[PDB]
Amino acid sequence: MQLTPFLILLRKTLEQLQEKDTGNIFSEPVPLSEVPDYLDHIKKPMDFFTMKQNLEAYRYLNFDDFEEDFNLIVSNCLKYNAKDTIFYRAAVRLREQGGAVLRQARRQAEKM
Numbered sequence: 001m002q003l004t005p006f007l008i009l010l011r012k013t014l015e016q017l018q019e020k021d022t023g024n025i026f027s028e029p030v031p032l033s034e035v036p037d038y039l040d041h042i043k044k045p046m047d048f049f050t051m052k053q054n055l056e057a058y059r060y061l062n063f064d065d066f067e068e069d070f071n072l073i074v075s076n077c078l079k080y081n082a083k084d085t086i087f088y089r090a091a092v093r094l095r096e097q098g099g100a101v102l103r104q105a106r107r108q109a110e111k112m
């Protein structure tokens with residue numbers, strides 16, 4: 001496929017995923033100065049701003065690599081936070097609502 005339409009699709013998909021994060025709790029990196037023990041548990045932090053930078057740096061050339069980093073946003077949050085927290089539930093909700101966005105977007109990628 002052609003790179004330009006694929007990146008346009010990823011930009012739109014990333015915007016749709018960010019729309020499901022209504023609190024914007026995943027918009028920027030987990031602030032390591034405010035969460036000092038975060039890297040003790042989390043091997044690869046991820047967030048939507050970093051994803052946008054990766055997208056524009058041409059680091060997502062297939063849908064799976066894009067989806068892998070989205071999945072890191074979710075899985076890091078499920079790992080770090082206790083189940084009874086808003087953060088944990090927000091990641092579950094993002095997993096659910098984002099899964100539908102990703103399935104539709106991947107179908108569009110496959111038609112390229």
Ligand SMILES: Cc1cc(O)cc2c1C(=O)CO2
Nearest residue numbers: 025030031035077080081087
């Ligand atoms: C996602 C997230 C955002 C933030 O601003 C602070 C955080 C988390 C955690 O997962 C724990 O601390």
